[PDB]
Amino acid sequence: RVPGGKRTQELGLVIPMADEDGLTDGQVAGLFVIALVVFISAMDLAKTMYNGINPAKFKTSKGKGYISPLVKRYIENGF
Amino acid sequence: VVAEAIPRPEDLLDSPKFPMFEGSTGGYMSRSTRERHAITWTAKGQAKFEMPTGGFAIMNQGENLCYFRKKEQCIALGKQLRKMKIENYKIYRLKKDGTVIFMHPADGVFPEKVNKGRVQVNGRPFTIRGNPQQSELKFTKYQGKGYEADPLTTMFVKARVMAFADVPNLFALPQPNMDELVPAEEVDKYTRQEYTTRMMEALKRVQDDRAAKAAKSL
Amino acid sequence: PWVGPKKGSWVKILRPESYWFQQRGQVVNVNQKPEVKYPVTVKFDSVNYANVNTNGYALWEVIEAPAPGPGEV
Amino acid sequence: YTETVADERLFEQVYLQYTSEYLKGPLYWHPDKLQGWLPDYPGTPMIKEGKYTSHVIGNLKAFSSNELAFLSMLFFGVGLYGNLQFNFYDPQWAKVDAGGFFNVSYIVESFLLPISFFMHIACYIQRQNGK
Amino acid sequence: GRCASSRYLQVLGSIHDIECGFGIDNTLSLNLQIFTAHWGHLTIILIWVSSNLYHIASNANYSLWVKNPIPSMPIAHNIWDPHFTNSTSTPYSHTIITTILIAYSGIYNQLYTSGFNTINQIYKTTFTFSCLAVISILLAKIHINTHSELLHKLASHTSQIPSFFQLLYFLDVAISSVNIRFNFHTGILVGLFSIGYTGHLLDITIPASRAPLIHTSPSYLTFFGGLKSNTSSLYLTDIAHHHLAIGIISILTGHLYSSFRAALGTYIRDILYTSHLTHSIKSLHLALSLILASCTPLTSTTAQHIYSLTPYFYLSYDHIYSTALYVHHSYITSFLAIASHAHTAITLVRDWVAPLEQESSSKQIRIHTHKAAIISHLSWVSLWLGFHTLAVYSHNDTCIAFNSPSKQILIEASNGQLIQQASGKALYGTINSINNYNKSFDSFIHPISPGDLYVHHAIALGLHITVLILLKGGLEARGSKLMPDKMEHSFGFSCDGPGRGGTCDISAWDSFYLATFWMLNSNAWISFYFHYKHLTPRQFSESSTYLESWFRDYLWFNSTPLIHGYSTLGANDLSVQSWSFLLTHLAWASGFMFLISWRGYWQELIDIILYIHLKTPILINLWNGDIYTPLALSIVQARFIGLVHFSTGLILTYPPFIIGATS
Amino acid sequence: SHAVKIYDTCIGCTLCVRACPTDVLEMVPASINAAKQVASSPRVEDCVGCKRCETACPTDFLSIRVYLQDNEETQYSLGLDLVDWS
Amino acid sequence: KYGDQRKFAAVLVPLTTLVFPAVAMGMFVLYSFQEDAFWRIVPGTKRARELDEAWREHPLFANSKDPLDGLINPDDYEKGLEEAWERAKPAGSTVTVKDKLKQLSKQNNPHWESWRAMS
Ligand code: CLA
Ligand code: CLA
Ligand code: CLA
Numbered sequence A: 001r002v003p004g005g006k007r008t009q010e011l012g013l014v015i016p017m018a019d020e021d022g023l024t025d026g027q028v029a030g031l032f033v034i035a036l037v038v039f040i041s042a043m044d045l046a047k048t049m050y051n052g053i054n055p056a057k058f059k060t061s062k063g064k065g066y067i068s069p070l071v072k073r074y075i076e077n078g079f
Numbered sequence B: 001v002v003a004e005a006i007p008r009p010e011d012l013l014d015s016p017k018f019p020m021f022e023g024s025t026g027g028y029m030s031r032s033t034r035e036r037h038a039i040t041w042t043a044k045g046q047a048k049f050e051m052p053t054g055g056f057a058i059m060n061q062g063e064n065l066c067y068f069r070k071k072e073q074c075i076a077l078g079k080q081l082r083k084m085k086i087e088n089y090k091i092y093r094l095k096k097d098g099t100v101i102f103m104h105p106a107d108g109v110f111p112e113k114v115n116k117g118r119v120q121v122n123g124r125p126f127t128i129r130g131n132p133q134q135s136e137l138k139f140t141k142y143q144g145k146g147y148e149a150d151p152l153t154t155m156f157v158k159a160r161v162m163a164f165a166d167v168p169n170l171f172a173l174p175q176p177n178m179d180e181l182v183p184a185e186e187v188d189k190y191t192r193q194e195y196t197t198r199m200m201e202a203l204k205r206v207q208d209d210r211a212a213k214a215a216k217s218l
Numbered sequence C: 001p002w003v004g005p006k007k008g009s010w011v012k013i014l015r016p017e018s019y020w021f022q023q024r025g026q027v028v029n030v031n032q033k034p035e036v037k038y039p040v041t042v043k044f045d046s047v048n049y050a051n052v053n054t055n056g057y058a059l060w061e062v063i064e065a066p067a068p069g070p071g072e073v
Numbered sequence D: 001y002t003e004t005v006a007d008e009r010l011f012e013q014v015y016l017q018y019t020s021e022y023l024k025g026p027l028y029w030h031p032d033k034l035q036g037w038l039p040d041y042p043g044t045p046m047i048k049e050g051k052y053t054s055h056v057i058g059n060l061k062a063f064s065s066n067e068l069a070f071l072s073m074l075f076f077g078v079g080l081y082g083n084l085q086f087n088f089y090d091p092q093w094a095k096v097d098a099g100g101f102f103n104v105s106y107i108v109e110s111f112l113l114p115i116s117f118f119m120h121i122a123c124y125i126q127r128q129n130g131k
Numbered sequence E: 001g002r003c004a005s006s007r008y009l010q011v012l013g014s015i016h017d018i019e020c021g022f023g024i025d026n027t028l029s030l031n032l033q034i035f036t037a038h039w040g041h042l043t044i045i046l047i048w049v050s051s052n053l054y055h056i057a058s059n060a061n062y063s064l065w066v067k068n069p070i071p072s073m074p075i076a077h078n079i080w081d082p083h084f085t086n087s088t089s090t091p092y093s094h095t096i097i098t099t100i101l102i103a104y105s106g107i108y109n110q111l112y113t114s115g116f117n118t119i120n121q122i123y124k125t126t127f128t129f130s131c132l133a134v135i136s137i138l139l140a141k142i143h144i145n146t147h148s149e150l151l152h153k154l155a156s157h158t159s160q161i162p163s164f165f166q167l168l169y170f171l172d173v174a175i176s177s178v179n180i181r182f183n184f185h186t187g188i189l190v191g192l193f194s195i196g197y198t199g200h201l202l203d204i205t206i207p208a209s210r211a212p213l214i215h216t217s218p219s220y221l222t223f224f225g226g227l228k229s230n231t232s233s234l235y236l237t238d239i240a241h242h243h244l245a246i247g248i249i250s251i252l253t254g255h256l257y258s259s260f261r262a263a264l265g266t267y268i269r270d271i272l273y274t275s276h277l278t279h280s281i282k283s284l285h286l287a288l289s290l291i292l293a294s295c296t297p298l299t300s301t302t303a304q305h306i307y308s309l310t311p312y313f314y315l316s317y318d319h320i321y322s323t324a325l326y327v328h329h330s331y332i333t334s335f336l337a338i339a340s341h342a343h344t345a346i347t348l349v350r351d352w353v354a355p356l357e358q359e360s361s362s363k364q365i366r367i368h369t370h371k372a373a374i375i376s377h378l379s380w381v382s383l384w385l386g387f388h389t390l391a392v393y394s395h396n397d398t399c400i401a402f403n404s405p406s407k408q409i410l411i412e413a414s415n416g417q418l419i420q421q422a423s424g425k426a427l428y429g430t431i432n433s434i435n436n437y438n439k440s441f442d443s444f445i446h447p448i449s450p451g452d453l454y455v456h457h458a459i460a461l462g463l464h465i466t467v468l469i470l471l472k473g474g475l476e477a478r479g480s481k482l483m484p485d486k487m488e489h490s491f492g493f494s495c496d497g498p499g500r501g502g503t504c505d506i507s508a509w510d511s512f513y514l515a516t517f518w519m520l521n522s523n524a525w526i527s528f529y530f531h532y533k534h535l536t537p538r539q540f541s542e543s544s545t546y547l548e549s550w551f552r553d554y555l556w557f558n559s560t561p562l563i564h565g566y567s568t569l570g571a572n573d574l575s576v577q578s579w580s581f582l583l584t585h586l587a588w589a590s591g592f593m594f595l596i597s598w599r600g601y602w603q604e605l606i607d608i609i610l611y612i613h614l615k616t617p618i619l620i621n622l623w624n625g626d627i628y629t630p631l632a633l634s635i636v637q638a639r640f641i642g643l644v645h646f647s648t649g650l651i652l653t654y655p656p657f658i659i660g661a662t663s
Numbered sequence F: 001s002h003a004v005k006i007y008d009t010c011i012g013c014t015l016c017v018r019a020c021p022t023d024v025l026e027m028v029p030a031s032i033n034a035a036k037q038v039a040s041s042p043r044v045e046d047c048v049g050c051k052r053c054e055t056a057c058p059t060d061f062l063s064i065r066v067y068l069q070d071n072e073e074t075q076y077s078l079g080l081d082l083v084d085w086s
Numbered sequence G: 001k002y003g004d005q006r007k008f009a010a011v012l013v014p015l016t017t018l019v020f021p022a023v024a025m026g027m028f029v030l031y032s033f034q035e036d037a038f039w040r041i042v043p044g045t046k047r048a049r050e051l052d053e054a055w056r057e058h059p060l061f062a063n064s065k066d067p068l069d070g071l072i073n074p075d076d077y078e079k080g081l082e083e084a085w086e087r088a089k090p091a092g093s094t095v096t097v098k099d100k101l102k103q104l105s106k107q108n109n110p111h112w113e114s115w116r117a118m119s
């Protein structure tokens, strides 16, 4: 390394480098699996945010919706 | 008013109605634009004028005809002609199909002269400050367009502003009873006119309960 | 029967968006036609940004204020 | 008859005066009229007659003015005593520095000074309402 | 008809303005979109944290820096750029070894203090934070589905009475509720997070900093002071005790509002209604403005107290970390401070209902009644500060150029000195009453000189003018004498035409645009003050009362190593710093034309260029311009782009100078 | 297209009509002023937005107000010459 | 060796800073020519109309855009307004409340949201 700046040269500040590898390739692959999971989930979230809420789902979607018993209490507790 | 038979500028090459004009690169860009505006007028003497697209021109003692890309250029030339005491000039918009639309002296009388049969379009019956606040019309028909509100809506929101400042006399909206209301929509009792009577009696009960509760420590 | 402030009488402007809001100006004339919405014509010593020192106001925007006095708008 | 501008202004005034009174009632149901919005909570009016109603002081609304005055003065005395006996007289810093512990009574008492301030505020509020 | 080239700029100028969305019809959609965006942003933050932790784990030397931190230098990440020399060796690598970058963030000290010892722990931490990012995205999906399920449950919802429509206002009570949010934020998110961090310190950080001790006994909660001698940082026991105290206080405070039951706690509306407030708390812009105005003191005090009382191991021993952290957090808090005012102006434009003309009930009403007095007095104090700081600086410059250093006007900073003396007496009384005295507080109190007084007056001037511009924009956003209908238009619009005197820069957004220059200038003054006092306290104390000293002994003198970085003599490890220095100068100057030259010139230029394209042989038969018509940038877009260039240049020109001067 | 609105304070100057470069404005009969005429904007689709009408209006605050709508621009409101959107 | 992570870099850096950005730019310019492009900020898109109509189909949000929504019993409000105007009607005035409100609701703004005619 060719240092720059007065202080590094006049104090002898050095930047050690590990002679080992750091992380093995297996650990990097393990991180990349979960990174890919984040990536897929983020693409799905971006799609959902782009399209937004669909209010007309009650005409076609199955089920009948649900309001959790605490959500009702929060509704009638005030605002 | 009778619209003329202004032909498409690509089919009227070498017409006697064209004034002698120098011709410049400022003319309408063919090969990319098909909508052209045409202005016609009748002059008395071959008086030199200035084309809106650069370069000068000399009118004809009889009919005149010019083609322009924009209505603004036609109106500029119309003002220039009218400065020379030349009335009776008409401005047409030519569609791509060749349809002729009569534009500038729309009813035959110039817009600065009052003519019967006209109605104030985009008129608002108050001072400019009378427009409703943008904050009042959030998520309504006029979400970010408070200047487009009909005067009835402006008065309604003004009355709402007047009302929602006497806080002590307001009526708090009762909290809905979610857990025990909310059946399936097929489970209704109809009787719409009775539903307003139920509204009256339920709100009376709510107000009486609130008065009774308030008259405990107040 | 005359309606509105007298001619030559100072009036305080009550139009909020007016350049002369809460200022004072002499009444040039008051249009007597009941159909006119802004009949009161007021002239001011201080011109607005359009270099116009006169404007027509409504009957409910002038309150017949006294004379300005020394160093007072 | 033709509708002069004065007649239109009169209709404006009539409409506004009627509607501003109507919208305050139980028949307009605007989101600004919800609980937590402009109007007071149903059974708990805060300000009436331009005076803090008894419901302002919460659970203390049932307390008498004399009771609140006594509590205010007592808490002021106790909290001021705690603060003065913790800061200037009988300092605890040296004692706790050498491995000791605070005089817990002083710490508990010293928190009664702002409590006393708000207690005397509540005493005045109760006195105004005649409670 | 279709759009022109300005569509991209128009769309991207409000790409996140969810209130301006076209499909959005109600506060339910707005609140749900905002909540989902919050979840995505939290995911981004977690991924960024995991990124830094990974690169420290893999492409770095944490295992070696932890052993000898004082003279060693950390590694940010490797350099893989095919543009470098495939031969020889770059100045950023030890010959044949790979290329590295020195980290100036400060994460090494953060991890060392927090108790990290091994690379494996950092790798596990990276994995956990990636897991947390997954969890955040899944929570976003969960909440989108729950709100859509409530909406679908409105297919089985009726009150059997006309009051059923009231449920319209309570659909987003999950997001818009305030009492529950305040209670749980202040209690859990603040107090219990502090208590959990105290537990972390007592279980890991203090055990992994000294010899083995008792089973984390209550002797781990100390009240020493600051600056433990060996590591030149705060005592970890003191930090744990501080977090414990803050946690207890905030946990107690968090039981204030009525959150889960109607029988406990007071409502925020009733608290405000009986005070000098009662603002419209349902506005999202108002909440955003007043919490950005809260992150601003927090970030500014973070900048001040990371330096004054260094909390991390060997952080004061790094000459570059200390300046970089302070400058970074000062810029962040300046941005948040101007954000608070910008969103206050947006609140007044969009989400504020005012009485008819005279009802002086709202706080904004009372402020607007005498807004002219506020602006006039702010202008007066700004004028006074500017006049009397520039004039005294000019006196000093002139009298020191004339060989007369003794003719300067040097007002001794007596008030700041009195405050420092009182604080020092208090601290010394604290220390003298200790059996373990001889403590240090580093730079909590610093030597104050006339140069300090003049720089503080300059900083006060900058703050006053920034607040003046922002406050004027906020107060006249709804209408001024020049344009008494400004609340009918958008928050940002071009102008009001050349008539009525001329109306360039009339919108409230234009007030923000003008105020951002003053924010940048005030921040530059603060950063220059800190950096100059950091480089040479003695020379700053003596020769900083005349501006020529700032020009020569700081800027011209300290820029020597940076320009020499790459030259016709070889390169240093500052080559990137010098190249980015020049690039940021180019970016700063490039935005001048977007600010000085305005639209019409360029629109004519674009018309000429488009004439060429529609006249070139091959282009005309493929592209007539009717699809994405090239047009010059609109006026507001032009001002914003020039502002972006100016801000980027001014901000990013500084870190190269900091690195060249300190390292 | 922009939005050009005429308010009641109009006094029938006709200056706004004369200043318009694309014939957006016109004079209509009315009974709210001594001139018995007020302005109207029947053709705001041709309003470029030059605001010359606002410059020419002499009322205390403009009886004619032009509201710019940039996310609304058409080929006529932009004054496109080299390019046709029809 | 301290290297051997550059095996990952030699693939990732060219990929994510050349292949992904170029694909993203091409996909963006392709998306720019869809009829759905920027449907949330660009007026007159088909999806905006469908979303607005879907909101209007919900029973809660049927009369949500009406600025006058809220009157529980509009007949009572109108009757009270008419009664209050009768006692204040000036002399032999011929204007009723019903037609006055009807003509105060009907304004003439043809060029308002005319962009709801293409998609
Ligand atoms: C340093 C700031 C700066 C820069 C770079 C420019 C650049 C330019 N100005 Mg300008 N201008 C500025 C400040 C600046 N101006 C200021 C302060 C004013 C005062 C109002 C003006 C006023 C002004 C006017 C009035 C005019 C110009 C014109 C021009 C253009 C003519 C020069 C040209 O085409 O070269 C090319 C542009 C360059 C920047 C040269 C460097 C190009 C780089 C180094 C190579 C490419 C980089 C590479 C592709 C990287 C890719 C990007 C990356 C994302 C991958 C050019 C775009 C004239 C014009 O447009 O006429 C043609 C013109 O009429 N300017
Ligand atoms: C009769 C002269 C006069 C008087 C009494 C005042 C009085 C005042 N001005 Mg002021 N002002 C004046 C002229 C005057 N001004 C002129 C000519 C200008 C244009 C440069 C300004 C520009 C100005 C600004 C920009 C501000 C004030 C402010 C103020 C107020 C705070 C005091 C201050 O800032 O003074 C400082 C005054 C100045 C910096 C302006 C220079 C002073 C001029 C040169 C004096 C001229 C006097 C005149 C020649 C006398 C001739 C007498 C002869 C004909 C017989 C105060 C009410 C401030 C305010 O509103 O806060 C409440 C404020 O922000 N003034
Ligand atoms: C607009 C006026 C103004 C403003 C905003 C400031 C702002 C500041 N001053 Mg300051 N100062 C001023 C005027 C002002 N000063 C004047 C006129 C003097 C006398 C020469 C001083 C003398 C002074 C000293 C000695 C010190 C400060 C310091 C400070 C900083 C800390 C706050 C403080 O203690 O100030 C005190 C608060 C004020 C001075 C407010 C007074 C405002 C009045 C209206 C100014 C005019 C007073 C008038 C001339 C008195 C005439 C008396 C005569 C009748 C006999 C802060 C940046 C301290 C500092 O930065 O240390 C690091 C510090 O030590 N100031």
Ligand SMILES: CC1=C(/C=C/C(C)=C/C=C/C(C)=C/C=C/C=C(C)/C=C/C=C(C)/C=C/C2=C(C)CCCC2(C)C)C(C)(C)CCC1
Pocket (backbone or CB within 6 Å): A029, A032, A033, A035, A036, A038, A039, A042, A043, A045, A046, E039, E040, E041, E043, E044, E047
């Ligand atoms: C199969 C497998 C494999 C492979 C893997 C891979 C292939 C991976 C990749 C990975 C990757 C390639 C990753 C990436 C990632 C990325 C990311 C992770 C990013 C993210 C982002 C975010 C998260 C954000 C977002 C957003 C935005 C910005 C927009 C708006 C919205 C939001 C917010 C969402 C191996 C053999 C190895 C192993 C076994 C298994």
Ligand code: SF4
Pocket (backbone or CB within 6 Å): F006, F009, F010, F011, F012, F013, F014, F015, F016, F017, F038, F039, F053, F056, F057, F058, F059, F062, F063, F064
């Ligand atoms: S210029 Fe103004 S006042 Fe005159 S006619 Fe036109 S709109 Fe009316």
Ligand code: SF4
Pocket (backbone or CB within 6 Å): F004, F019, F020, F021, F022, F023, F024, F025, F046, F047, F048, F049, F050, F051, F052, F053, F054, F066
């Ligand atoms: S802005 Fe220009 S084109 Fe539009 S109506 Fe006014 S004068 Fe005519």
